[PDB]
RNA sequence: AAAAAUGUUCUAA
RNA sequence: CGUCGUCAGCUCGUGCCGUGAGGUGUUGGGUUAAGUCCCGCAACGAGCGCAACCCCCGCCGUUAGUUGCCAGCGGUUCGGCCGGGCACUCUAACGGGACUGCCCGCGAAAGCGGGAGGAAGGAGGGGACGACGUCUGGUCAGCAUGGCCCUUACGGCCUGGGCGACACACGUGCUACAAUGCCCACUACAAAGCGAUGCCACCCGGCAACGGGGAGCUAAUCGCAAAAAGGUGGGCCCAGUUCGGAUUGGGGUCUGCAACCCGACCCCAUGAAGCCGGAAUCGCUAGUAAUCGCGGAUCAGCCAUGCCGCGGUGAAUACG
């Protein structure tokens, strides 16, 4: 009666709950499209069940805290895919090759002393 | 400026000089190191010798300089320009 | 409120009184330098105006 | 000059702190200054004993200075009277309950701080500096250590042109963290000036 | 003008404003950390010595 | 019957935690296992050199690890025994109702 | 403009508050 | 690069048209990371081209891009001590990228106020072989035709 | 198959 | 401590060659980010370096469940709030995990190319780590220290002044020249840190800095807290402007014994230069650059647009 996937991306954690239903999505009690309103990277967070024709097959009850709105998006993308194999493991092919089962570890590189950001350097002026 | 919750600032010792001079039928030369003291209406007519760090510059105080500190009339930097 | 021409009278006469009494800001407004504690080694270009470039010290050969 | 201090580099892997205790923000320094004031006192008093490492523990109103010394007998004095002349003068500075303990060191020539002081004392008695280095490194290898390096910087033999001298036997991997490397420095001070004595004893990887 | 200044720094001032911190170990008046009573140099020396309880070279 | 332990060394903080929750696990009832509260890290970034060399530092940090231990029922057979326990040096204990 | 203390943007840049960045 | 080539970064197809070409384009509109702003600009322009001359805009967009791809461009070489204008053909990758670059670039030249109008109107002109990004592409191809004498210096 | 001149005195530790 | 230079190097013991300096080894074939490995060889080993061990980040586990968390039943002033629970998220310690281990191909080998599994693959990303030495590099002003020098003074206290000067010149930056923008209002999503004459919830005063009240918090509990770009809605309409916020007049706020020289801030007014910058020149190869905000050290206050960190959004291109 319930299927779960954990989505992590860039300090943004996601607890997505795949439950059967007409298709509706919720995020932190707010509806999806009320939460990522006018954020065109919206539908990428649901693309998992576009490679597995379950768009309207599940409702989803999602939670995200930390990171940022797009950081949560790829975390929702990862959990929705994570829950689908947790629903059935036959789904793994058509999900793993499409990069859905992997978690991109691209995090902000730490600032380093003598520099202005991770690698941006103070302007060189010989004399 | 000095927060007017607190008063207007005289070092108290320089004030003693002002009013000791008032009650005596002033004036007299008033040397001071209190550039940080406000000009106060009891000073008009006096000539207060202000120390710029080097010399004690005299300053005759008129009614139209009461809002200011005494160091505004003894400048600390000799300049003359470049040439 | 007092405006256009009149306002500028009370601005001018105030600066005037600053220069008249010998206030340090009056010395500042005389020589046309900053009055609010800014440094003048570099910049102050608004208050001083276009750079009157001069020759400099010479290195040895 | 470009080399990390081998102890600071290892603290938490090979090396435990000389002073270990907890203290909140409001009196970390007070406990630190009292320790610095204690260690100096003993590093002045127990210098004639061959003091190698002062351990200072702290809990509540009582400080437990476990001092490590080559010759413990010259510290304790007569059956515990010099140890008592200090267990008191320590408490006179501690104000607390000063627990002063003495510890036997296995082989002093396996103690980098000691050897560093010996070479420092030797070139204070105007010895051959180069020879004093080869002498030292040798005593350490004999004493079983897996490697030793001894460095002297300064006006070696009073020469106006200052200079570094060193020797090393066995391995001394300074970049290896599992390598137990006792570091010790002693400062030689002579008529012509001041000289630096760095001792690196490889005890063996763990 | 060091020792008299390591001394005067201690002595309680005429005004709390003149209160400035000063290293306990070397007497440096700049880059002095409240937490240790030391300066940034002495901080590095005592640390490397292991005489600074609980502080290690950070990396991340 | 709450007890919170602090210290810089986390190795001793953990052995000084389990030595407590193993104690009150002698005279029951239950204890609430040692939760690790978040570490409070105090950094220090100082110039590596004593002079002028600004763009080269060395990072240090002071780690103040945190553990909480709760013994659910009082039972004075440990509210006497815990006082007879051996907690290492760099461990500070706070015990609350 | 961050340099404009007279707007919400300038008060954010100096991290101060006022009629132009009310808290 | 010195050791090996650069591996061309593959982009995620955009969520409206499913096109990597749209994505690279929106990335060329983007400044300071404000992608969604650049997403709105490309998409609000996509509407306008579906209005003015009602056509499937993705087809118009790909006619602009196609009509801006430069097939040749001069490049400097060396032999002895020279720095010629060597006419060398353009790799299909650099073909696309110069288009996308000059597209946005010449579009931002245009005088209409808001961006999507500037983007839409250039893609309308460039899909018909007019406007800035064309006059640049054609001009580049012109200079290469000129220096066809230094073509024997092609590697 | 090569656009472009020069570097004060003693000391080289 | 900087530097060359995270560059792949620098050497030693013995043996061999050479009258000797010195040579060999350390060269040569291939390979690697690497003197990295392999093969060869009058060389055979060794050491300082390189890699590794260590720290953060990415996947899973184990042990943990309050101050953290709420999946599901119970209530519910509808706020995880109370029952209860630790599943999840998390917090934080200990583990596991990738080894070119597997396949195909090449190869003498080392490896290299590609494919599989996998969260991760070729050193996964980032840090810490800097060889022999070089620059008579830097620091006697952090400290130490030899010598030279001063001794009612070159020592010491104090008050004021100066380190903030300004015809000029350079370096590093902050803010801009605008519409992919500016402005008001509403509305979202961070991490890392700090906090007991400390952080200040909330309340009234004030246009506002702030003031006065006034809880909580020795802090996964109370607070700093608003994150901002963003989203939504409206205004401006190409103007030296609703761009820009310098300069200056006035009016205050606070810290402080004291803001004249010489503090920050707040309100009214003022509203400069600047329409994208000559010769020339800098940084960056990916969660980088670019942009956006946040915190800390020092600190009464603060001239911080600086420094060290933190996350948000997030590109372009590498033929060679
Ligand atoms: Mg984390
Ligand atoms: Mg960033
Ligand atoms: Mg000035
Ligand atoms: Mg001194
Ligand atoms: Mg002070
Ligand atoms: Mg200080
Ligand atoms: Mg710098
Ligand atoms: Mg801006
Ligand atoms: Mg020539
Ligand atoms: Mg000549
Ligand atoms: Mg030989
Ligand atoms: Mg021979
Ligand atoms: Mg030889
Ligand atoms: Mg060989
Ligand atoms: Mg050789
Ligand atoms: Mg070589
Ligand atoms: Mg060689
Ligand atoms: Mg050779
Ligand atoms: Mg390398
Ligand atoms: Mg290494
Ligand atoms: Mg559990
Ligand atoms: Mg020199
Ligand atoms: Mg000296
Ligand atoms: Mg000195
Ligand atoms: Mg200065
Ligand atoms: Mg200039
Ligand atoms: Mg700046
Ligand atoms: Mg500049
Ligand atoms: Mg602070
Ligand atoms: Mg704040
Ligand atoms: Mg104007
Ligand atoms: Mg103009
Ligand atoms: Mg305007
Ligand atoms: Mg404005
Ligand atoms: Mg004013
Ligand atoms: Mg001032
Ligand atoms: Mg314009
Ligand atoms: Mg430009
Ligand atoms: Mg690189
Ligand atoms: Mg401050
Ligand atoms: Mg200023
Ligand atoms: Mg700041
Ligand atoms: Zn110091």
UniProtKB/Swiss-Prot annotation, chain B:
Similarity annotation: Belongs to the universal ribosomal protein uS19 family.
Stored SUPFAM superfamilies: Ribosomal protein S19
Record flagged with keyword rRNA-binding: yes
Family matches, as PANTHER family: RIBOSOMAL PROTEIN S19P FAMILY MEMBER (PTHR11880), SMALL RIBOSOMAL SUBUNIT PROTEIN US19M (PTHR11880:SF8)
Self-association and partners: Part of the 30S ribosomal subunit. Forms a loose dimer with protein S13.
Xref: NCBIfam families: rpsS_bact
Role played: Located at the top of the head of the 30S subunit, extending towards the 50S subunit, which it may contact in the 70S complex. Contacts several RNA helices of the 16S rRNA.
Domain of life: Bacteria
GO CC annotation: cytoplasm; small ribosomal subunit
Signal peptide: none
A GO biological-process term: translation
Descriptive protein name: Small ribosomal subunit protein uS19
Transmembrane segments: none
Organism of provenance: Thermus thermophilus (strain ATCC 27634 / DSM 579 / HB8)
Keyword set, alphabetical order: Ribonucleoprotein, Ribosomal protein, RNA-binding, rRNA-binding
GO molecular function terms attached to this record: rRNA binding; structural constituent of ribosome
Alphabetical list of InterPro entries matching this protein: Ribosomal_uS19 (IPR002222), Ribosomal_uS19_bac-type (IPR005732), Ribosomal_uS19_CS (IPR020934), Ribosomal_uS19_SF (IPR023575)
Swiss-Prot record, chain D:
UniProt GO molecular function: mRNA binding; rRNA binding; structural constituent of ribosome
Every KH type-2 domain range: 38-106
Family matches, as InterPro entries: KH_dom, KH_dom-like_a/b, KH_dom_type_2, KH_sf_prok-type, Ribosomal_S3_C_sf, Ribosomal_uS3_bac-typ, Ribosomal_uS3_C, Ribosomal_uS3_CS
Gene3D superfamilies: 3.30.300.20, Ribosomal protein S3, C-terminal domain (3.30.1140.32)
A Pfam family this chain is assigned to: KH_2
GO cellular component: cytosolic small ribosomal subunit
Keywords: Ribonucleoprotein, Ribosomal protein, RNA-binding, rRNA-binding
CDD domains assigned: KH-II_30S_S3 (cd02412)
A single GO BP: translation
PROSITE patterns: KH_TYPE_2, RIBOSOMAL_S3
SUPFAM superfamilies in the record: Prokaryotic type KH domain (KH-domain type II), Ribosomal protein S3 C-terminal domain
Family assignment from sequence similarity: Belongs to the universal ribosomal protein uS3 family.
Subunit field text: Part of the 30S ribosomal subunit. Forms a tight complex with proteins S10 and S14.
Job description of the protein: Binds the lower part of the 30S subunit head. Binds mRNA in the 70S ribosome, positioning it for translation.
The protein's name in its UniProt record: Small ribosomal subunit protein uS3
Species per Swiss-Prot/TrEMBL record: Thermus thermophilus (strain ATCC 27634 / DSM 579 / HB8)
UniProtKB/Swiss-Prot annotation, chain F:
Gene Ontology BP annotations: translation
Molecular functions per Gene Ontology: rRNA binding; structural constituent of ribosome; tRNA binding
Entry GO terms, CC: ribonucleoprotein complex; ribosome
Cited InterPro entries: Ribosomal_uS10, Ribosomal_uS10_CS, Ribosomal_uS10_dom, Ribosomal_uS10_dom_sf
One Pfam family cited in the UniProt record for this chain: Ribosomal_S10
Keyword list, A-Z: Ribonucleoprotein, Ribosomal protein, RNA-binding, rRNA-binding
Family: Belongs to the universal ribosomal protein uS10 family.
Protein name in the entry: Small ribosomal subunit protein uS10
Name of the gene this protein is made from: rpsJ
From Swiss-Prot, chain H:
Any coiled-coil regions, as ranges: none
Pfam families the UniProt entry points to: Ribosomal_S7
PROSITE patterns: RIBOSOMAL_S7 (PS00052)
MF GO annotations: rRNA binding; structural constituent of ribosome; tRNA binding
Annotated keywords: Ribonucleoprotein, Ribosomal protein, RNA-binding, rRNA-binding, tRNA-binding
Protein's GO biological process: translation
Keyword Cytoplasm: no
SUPFAM superfamilies: Ribosomal protein S7 (SSF47973)
Disulfide bond entries: none
GO cellular component: small ribosomal subunit
Claim: Ribonucleoprotein is one of the keywords in the record: yes
Family from the record: Belongs to the universal ribosomal protein uS7 family.
Subunit (UniProt): Part of the 30S ribosomal subunit. Contacts proteins S9 and S11. Binds to the C-terminus of IF3 and to the C-terminus of Era.
Function: One of the primary rRNA binding proteins, it binds directly to 3'-end of the 16S rRNA where it nucleates assembly of the head domain of the 30S subunit. Is located at the subunit interface close to the decoding center. Binds mRNA and the E site tRNA blocking its exit path in the ribosome. This blockage implies that this section of the ribosome must be able to move to release the deacetylated tRNA.
Stated name of the protein: Small ribosomal subunit protein uS7
Organism: Thermus thermophilus (strain ATCC 27634 / DSM 579 / HB8)
């Amino acid at each position: 009666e319930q299927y779960y996937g954990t989505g992590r991306r860039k300090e943004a954690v996601a607890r997505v709950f795949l439950r059967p239903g007409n298709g509706k999505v919720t995020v932190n009690g707010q509806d999806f499209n009320e939460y990522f309103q006018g954020l065109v990277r919206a539908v990428a967070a649901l693309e998992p069940l576009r490679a597995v024709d379950a768009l309207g097959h599940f409702d989803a009850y999602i939670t995200v805290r930390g990171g940022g709105k797009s950081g949560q998006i790829d975390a929702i993308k990862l959990g929705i895919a994570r829950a689908l194999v947790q629903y059935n493991p036959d789904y793994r092919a058509k999900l793993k090759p499409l990069g859905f089962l992997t978690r991109d570890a691209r995090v902000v590189e730490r600032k380093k002393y003598g520099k202005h950001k991770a690698r941006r350097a103070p302007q060189y002026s010989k004399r | 400026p000095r927060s007017l919750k607190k008063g207007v600032f005289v070092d108290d010792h320089l004030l003693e000089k002002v009013l000791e001079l008032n009650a005596k039928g002033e004036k007299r030369l008033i040397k001071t190191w209190s550039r940080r003291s406000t000009i106060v209406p009891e000073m008009v007519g006096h000539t207060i010798a202000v120390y710029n760090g080097k010399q004690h510059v005299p300053v005759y105080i008129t009614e139209n300089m009461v809002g200011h500190k005494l160091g505004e009339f003894a400048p600390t930097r000799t300049y003359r320009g470049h040439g | 409120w007092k405006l256009e021409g009149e306002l500028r009278a009370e601005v001018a006469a105030n600066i005037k009184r600053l220069m008249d009494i010998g206030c340090y800001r009056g010395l500042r407004h005389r020589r046309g330098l900053p009055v609010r504690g800014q440094r003048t080694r570099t910049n102050a270009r608004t208050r001083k105006g276009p750079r009157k470039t001069v020759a400099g010290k010479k290195k040895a050969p | 000059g470009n080399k990390i201090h081998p102890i600071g580099f290892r603290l938490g892997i090979t090396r435990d702190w000389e002073s270990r205790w907890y203290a909140g923000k409001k009196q970390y320094r007070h406990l630190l200054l009292e320790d610095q004031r204690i260690r100096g006192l003993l590093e002045k008093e127990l210098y004639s004993a061959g003091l190698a490492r002062v351990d200072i523990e702290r809990a509540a109103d009582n400080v437990a200075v476990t001092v490590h010394v080559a010759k413990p007998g010259v510290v304790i004095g007569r059956g515990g009277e010099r140890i008592r002349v200090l267990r008191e003068e320590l408490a006179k500075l501690t104000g607390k309950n000063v627990a002063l303990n003495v510890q036997e060191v296995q082989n002093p020539n396996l103690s980098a701080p000691l050897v560093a002081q010996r070479v420092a004392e030797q070139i204070e008695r105007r010895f051959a500096v180069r020879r004093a280095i080869k002498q030292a490194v040798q005593r350490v290898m004999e004493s079983g250590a897996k490697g030793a390096k001894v460095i002297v910087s300064g006006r070696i033999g009073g020469a106006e042109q200052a200079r570094t001298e060193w020797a090393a036997q066995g391995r001394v991997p300074l970049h290896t963290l599992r390598a137990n490397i006792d570091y010790g420095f002693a400062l030689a001070r002579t008529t012509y000036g001041v000289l630096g004595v760095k001792a690196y004893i490889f005890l063996g990887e763990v | 003008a060091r020792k008299a200044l390591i001394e005067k720094a201690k002595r309680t001032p005429k005004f709390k404003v003149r209160a400035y911190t000063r290293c306990v170990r070397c007497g440096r008046a700049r880059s002095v950390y409240r937490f240790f009573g030391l300066c940034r140099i002495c901080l590095r020396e005592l640390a490397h010595k292991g005489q600074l309880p609980g502080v290690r070279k950070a990396s991340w | 019957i709450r007890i919170k332990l602090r210290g810089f060394d986390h190795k001793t903080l953990d052995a000084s935690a389990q030595k407590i929750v193993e104690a009150a696990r002698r005279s029951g009832a239950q204890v609430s296992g040692p939760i690790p509260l978040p570490t409070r890290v105090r950094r220090f970034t100082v110039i590596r050199g004593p002079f002028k060399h600004k763009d080269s530092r060395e990072h240090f940090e002071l780690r103040t690890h945190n553990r909480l231990v709760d013994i659910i029922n009082p039972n004075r057979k440990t509210i006497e025994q815990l006082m007879t326990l051996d907690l290492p040096t760099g461990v500070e204990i706070e015990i609350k109702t | 403009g961050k340099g404009d203390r007279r707007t919400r943007r300038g008060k954010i840049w100096r991290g101060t508050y006022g009629k132009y960045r009310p808290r | 690069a010195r050791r090996r080539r650069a591996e061309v970064r593959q982009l995620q197809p955009d969520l409206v048209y499913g096109d990597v070409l749209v994505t690279a384009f929106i990335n060329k509109i983007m400044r300071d990371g404000k992608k969604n702003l650049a997403a709105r600009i490309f998409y609000d322009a996509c509407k306008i081209i579906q209005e003015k001359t009602g056509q499937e805009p993705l087809k118009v967009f790909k006619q602009a891009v196609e009509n801006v791809k430069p097939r040749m461009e001069v490049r400097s070489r060396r032999v002895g001590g020279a720095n010629y204008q060597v006419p060398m053909e353009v790799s299909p990758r650099r073909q696309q990228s110069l288009a996308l670059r000059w597209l946005v670039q010449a579009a931002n030249q245009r005088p209409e106020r808001r961006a999507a109008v500037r983007i839409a109107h250039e893609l309308m002109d460039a899909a018909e072989g007019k406007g800035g990004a064309v006059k640049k592409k054609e001009d580049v191809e012109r200079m290469a035709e000129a220096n066809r004498a230094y073509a024997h210096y092609r590697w």
